[PDB]
């Protein structure tokens, strides 16, 4: 191939790479008696099923195609049956169904690329689709040519959110992503029990801490029932960010701090927040000397019971 | 995880046997009747020697195979372990029984 | 029985033997060899006969699907279309013996489509979703099987047409079960008015407005208002406005008349 495209011309470059393709009735037959040949049948039959073969056949399509296809041309139809064939062989690679999707994207296809990421995500297994589900819904929301309703790109994270965390991943962008485009589209912050789901998957505590801050800005009775829910090494850190969530709106914050402390070995971080509490205030360091003391009192306990 | 059944375990072990005799086959090519009487009910089937041979000779061979590798299990049975104080073979053996069950 | 006359190559012998295993119903491990011994001596028309007797003895859809895995593992359309008419039929004809599962009969119907997906004829993929969702209104996975299909081979109008009806069915079932989620009204409400615009949509509106205490209760409320404003108004504004007014009514009678309706709005 690769001589014949410098002296000649590609379509005489594809035309001996098209006698090397010929799917020819059935290739599950085939492929499976080619295994069980003892070396005695010929990989002259099988030649279709071979991945290096497609994707240097493609990348001549591709190249050789204008940068307007428009799908009126003839070649845009050669390289989309040549793409579709790869996933009918089922021979298709998850960069390779990337390079394709992309492909349509660029030429305006953009409603057939969506079906491109549909075709595919089934084949594949997770740890994979994750990296899929990114380009698809990233697709979604922010390409100019795809007019989607908000219902049938709501469908199309909770189709993956559930499927995707079913299996088990941390999925911290598909949270964010079905989290950042509702105030752009929808706007009402319904964001946090989409979010909180994050955090309560069945990391996290990287999803929980930047949304708790985003619903003090619209309204503390949101906020307090999440400073309840954060807390319910890890252990310590949702401590920690319940102390926080109470500066920001002190009582029920050095009880917490008693309950962080007594939640788990060290405290002194636990320290540093009832300290920063009684530092936040513009009363009397009575009541810290007090709380230091029964911090101290606490240690003491577990010493004698150790 | 489980055991595997006597259903499963006869099929797997009938899939092993034709495997084995498809390779019988393959490598035989890479190499080179029913009368009922009538007199009785009995029946006559012709047979050509060979295959029956082979099946005879098989059935031998794989007799052979278990038998070797049970006994060279034997072997590592009774050299493996050494730490509990028994008697015999037979104590070993029981304890080692024992230590299967824990 | 059997390894001992395939050793001896008699395989008219382990051909009359296995009719008779097969003929006192034993399981699915005698079959499955029983086809596989077929495969072996090439008899492609009587292992055909085989899952014709197959599938009368284990009735279930993983011996009819093995038969369309047999046929398309050999590329002959005109059986395997036919294998797919027998096995959908006696669903239908077989109904009322409840022998095949909701789940059971949506892997009959997908594996049906994306079949009619790969030869290129998607009007008969698509009009068998509707056949099979009003033959079967009972299981929802046989339409939400529906949906998949439309995603991956459908025009973007039918895709919309079919996602606008899982949303509703989605968004009413929480609401039955969860009872003051009022972040799930202004959406569902706003799924009816997109999309549904029709007698459910005034009347949804009514049975939002049935739901409606909360601060974050009540501006749902006026959220029905404007859309009861937008398209009587005034007589389901005093209605509400009824929750307690002396200074209200006092309000209402010096700028009801004598201005309008949106100045009759302003005192609720």
């Given at each position: 191939?690769?001589?014949?495209?410098?002296?000649?011309?590609?379509?005489?470059?594809?035309?001996?790479?098209?006698?090397?393709?010929?799917?020819?009735?059935?290739?599950?037959?085939?492929?499976?008696?080619?295994?069980?040949?003892?070396?005695?049948?010929?990989?002259?039959?099988?030649?279709?099923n071979s991945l290096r073969i497609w994707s240097k056949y493609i990348d001549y399509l591709e190249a050789?195609c204008?940068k307007?296809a428009?799908?009126?041309?003839?070649?845009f139809?050669?390289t989309k049956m040549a793409y579709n064939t790869v996933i009918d062989l089922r021979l298709i690679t998850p960069a390779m169904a990337e390079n394709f999707a992309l492909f349509l994207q660029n030429h305006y296809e953009v409603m057939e690329s969506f079906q491109v990421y549909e075709k595919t995500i089934p084949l594949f297994p997770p740890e994979i689709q994750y990296e899929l589900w990114i380009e698809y819904l990233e697709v979604a929301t922010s390409h100019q040519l795809s007019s989607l309703s908000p219902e049938h790109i709501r469908f199309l994270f909770e189709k993956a959110l559930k499927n995707l965390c079913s299996n088990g991943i941390d999925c911290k962008t598909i949270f964010i992503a079905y989290s950042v485009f509702e105030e752009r589209i929808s706007?009402?912050?319904?964001k946090?029990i989409e979010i909180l789901r994050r955090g309560a998957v069945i990391r996290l505590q990287l999803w929980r801490m930047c949304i708790?801050?985003?619903?003090?800005?619209?309204?503390?009775?949101?906020?307090?029932?999440?400073?309840?829910?954060?807390?319910?090494?890890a252990?310590?850190?949702?401590?920690?960010?319940?102390?926080?969530?109470?500066?920001?709106?002190?009582?029920?914050?050095?009880?917490?701090?008693?309950?962080?402390?007594?939640?788990?070995?060290?405290?002194?971080?636990?320290?540093?927040?009832?300290?920063?509490?009684?530092?936040?205030?513009?009363?009397?360091?009575?009541?810290?000397?007090?709380?230091?003391?029964?911090?101290?009192?606490?240690?003491?306990?577990?010493?004698?019971?150790? | 995880?489980?055991?595997?059944?006597?259903?499963?375990?006869?099929?797997?072990?009938?899939?092993?046997?034709?495997?084995?005799?498809?390779?019988?086959?393959?490598?035989?090519?890479?190499?080179?009747?029913?009368?009922?009487?009538?007199?009785?009910?009995?029946?006559?089937?012709?047979?050509?020697?060979?295959?029956?041979?082979?099946?005879?000779?098989?059935?031998?061979?794989?007799?052979?195979?278990?038998?070797?590798?049970?006994?060279?299990?034997?072997?590592?049975?009774?050299?493996?372990?050494?730490?509990?104080?028994?008697?015999?073979?037979?104590?070993?053996?029981?304890?080692?029984?024992?230590?299967?069950?824990? | 029985?059997?390894?001992?006359?395939?050793?001896?190559?008699?395989?008219?012998?382990?051909?009359?033997?296995?009719?008779?295993?097969?003929?006192?119903?034993?399981?699915?491990?005698?079959?499955?060899?029983?086809?596989?011994?077929?495969?072996?001596?090439?008899?492609?028309?009587?292992?055909?006969?085989?899952?014709?007797?197959?599938?009368?003895?284990?009735?279930?859809?993983?011996?009819?699907?093995?038969?369309?895995?047999?046929?398309?593992?050999?590329?002959?359309?005109?059986?395997?279309?036919?294998?797919?008419?027998?096995?959908?039929?006696?669903?239908?004809?077989?109904?009322?013996?409840?022998?095949?599962?909701?789940?059971?009969?949506?892997?009959?119907?997908n594996?049906?489509?994306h079949?009619?997906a790969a030869?290129?004829?998607?009007?008969?993929?698509?009009?068998?979703?509707?056949?099979?969702?009003?033959?079967?209104?009972?299981?929802?996975?046989?339409?939400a099987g529906?949906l998949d299909f439309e995603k991956q081979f459908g025009?973007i109008?039918?895709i919309?047409?079919?996602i606008?009806?899982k949303r509703?069915?989605?968004?009413?079932?929480?609401?039955?079960?969860?009872?003051?989620?009022?972040?799930?009204?202004?959406?569902?409400?706003?799924?009816?008015?997109?999309?549904?615009?029709?007698?459910?949509?005034?009347?949804?509106?009514?049975?939002?407005?049935?739901?409606?205490?909360?601060?974050?209760?009540?501006?749902?409320?006026?959220?029905?208002?404007?859309?009861?404003?937008?398209?009587?108004?005034?007589?389901?504004?005093?209605?509400?406005?009824?929750?307690?007014?002396?200074?209200?009514?006092?309000?209402?009678?010096?700028?009801?008349?004598?201005?309008?309706?949106?100045?009759?709005?302003?005192?609720?």
């Amino acid at each position: 191939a690769d001589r014949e495209l410098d002296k000649e011309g590609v379509e005489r470059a594809f035309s001996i790479l098209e006698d090397a393709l010929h799917v020819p009735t059935n290739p599950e037959i085939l492929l499976e008696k080619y295994k069980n040949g003892h070396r005695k049948i010929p990989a002259q039959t099988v030649l279709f099923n071979s991945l290096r073969i497609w994707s240097k056949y493609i990348d001549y399509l591709e190249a050789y195609c204008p940068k307007d296809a428009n799908s009126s041309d003839k070649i845009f139809n050669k390289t989309k049956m040549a793409y579709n064939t790869v996933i009918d062989l089922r021979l298709i690679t998850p960069a390779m169904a990337e390079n394709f999707a992309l492909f349509l994207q660029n030429h305006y296809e953009v409603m057939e690329s969506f079906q491109v990421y549909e075709k595919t995500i089934p084949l594949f297994p997770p740890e994979i689709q994750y990296e899929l589900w990114i380009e698809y819904l990233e697709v979604a929301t922010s390409h100019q040519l795809s007019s989607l309703s908000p219902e049938h790109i709501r469908f199309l994270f909770e189709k993956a959110l559930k499927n995707l965390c079913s299996n088990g991943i941390d999925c911290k962008t598909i949270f964010i992503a079905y989290s950042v485009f509702e105030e752009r589209i929808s706007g009402l912050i319904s964001k946090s029990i989409e979010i909180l789901r994050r955090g309560a998957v069945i990391r996290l505590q990287l999803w929980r801490m930047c949304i708790s801050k985003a619903e003090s800005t619209l309204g503390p009775s949101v906020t307090r029932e999440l400073y309840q829910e954060c807390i319910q090494k890890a252990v310590e850190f949702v401590i920690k960010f319940s102390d926080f969530e109470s500066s920001i709106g002190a009582r029920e914050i050095l009880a917490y701090g008693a309950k962080l402390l007594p939640p788990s070995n060290t405290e002194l971080w636990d320290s540093f927040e009832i300290f920063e509490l009684k530092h936040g205030d513009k009363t009397y360091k009575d009541m810290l000397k007090m709380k230091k003391v029964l911090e101290s009192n606490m240690l003491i306990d577990s010493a004698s019971v150790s | 995880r489980g055991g595997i059944s006597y259903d499963q375990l006869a099929k797997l072990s009938y899939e092993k046997t034709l495997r084995n005799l498809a390779t019988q086959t393959q490598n035989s090519s890479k190499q080179d009747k029913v009368q009922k009487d009538t007199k009785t009910g009995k029946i006559t089937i012709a047979d050509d020697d060979k295959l029956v041979n082979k099946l005879a000779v098989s059935l031998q061979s794989e007799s052979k195979k278990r038998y070797e590798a049970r006994k060279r299990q034997m072997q590592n049975a009774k050299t493996l372990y050494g730490v509990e104080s028994f008697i015999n073979d037979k104590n070993k053996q029981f304890n080692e029984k024992l230590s299967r069950e824990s | 029985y059997l390894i001992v006359e395939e050793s001896l190559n008699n395989v008219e012998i382990v051909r009359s033997l296995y009719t008779k295993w097969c003929s006192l119903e034993p399981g699915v491990n005698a079959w499955n060899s029983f086809v596989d011994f077929e495969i072996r001596q090439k008899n492609w028309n009587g292992v055909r006969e085989i899952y014709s007797k197959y599938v009368m003895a284990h009735p279930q859809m993983q011996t009819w699907l093995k038969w369309v895995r047999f046929e398309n593992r050999h590329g002959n359309t005109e059986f395997t279309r036919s294998v797919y008419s027998l096995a959908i039929d006696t669903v239908a004809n077989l109904q009322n013996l409840q022998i095949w599962s909701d789940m059971e009969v949506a892997k009959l119907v997908n594996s049906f489509a994306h079949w009619e997906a790969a030869q290129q004829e998607y009007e008969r993929s698509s009009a068998l979703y509707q056949i099979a969702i009003e033959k079967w209104p009972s299981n929802q996975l046989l339409k939400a099987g529906l949906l998949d299909f439309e995603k991956q081979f459908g025009d973007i109008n039918s895709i919309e047409e079919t996602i606008s009806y899982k949303r509703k069915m989605e968004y009413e079932t929480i609401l039955s079960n969860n009872a003051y989620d009022y972040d799930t009204w202004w959406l569902y409400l706003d799924l009816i008015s997109e999309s549904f615009p029709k007698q459910i949509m005034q009347t949804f509106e009514k049975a939002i407005v049935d739901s409606r205490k909360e601060l974050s209760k009540n501006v749902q409320w006026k959220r029905y208002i404007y859309l009861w404003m937008r398209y009587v108004e005034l007589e389901l504004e005093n209605s509400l406005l009824e929750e307690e007014f002396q200074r209200l009514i006092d309000d209402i009678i010096p700028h009801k008349h004598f201005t309008k309706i949106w100045l009759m709005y302003a005192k609720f």
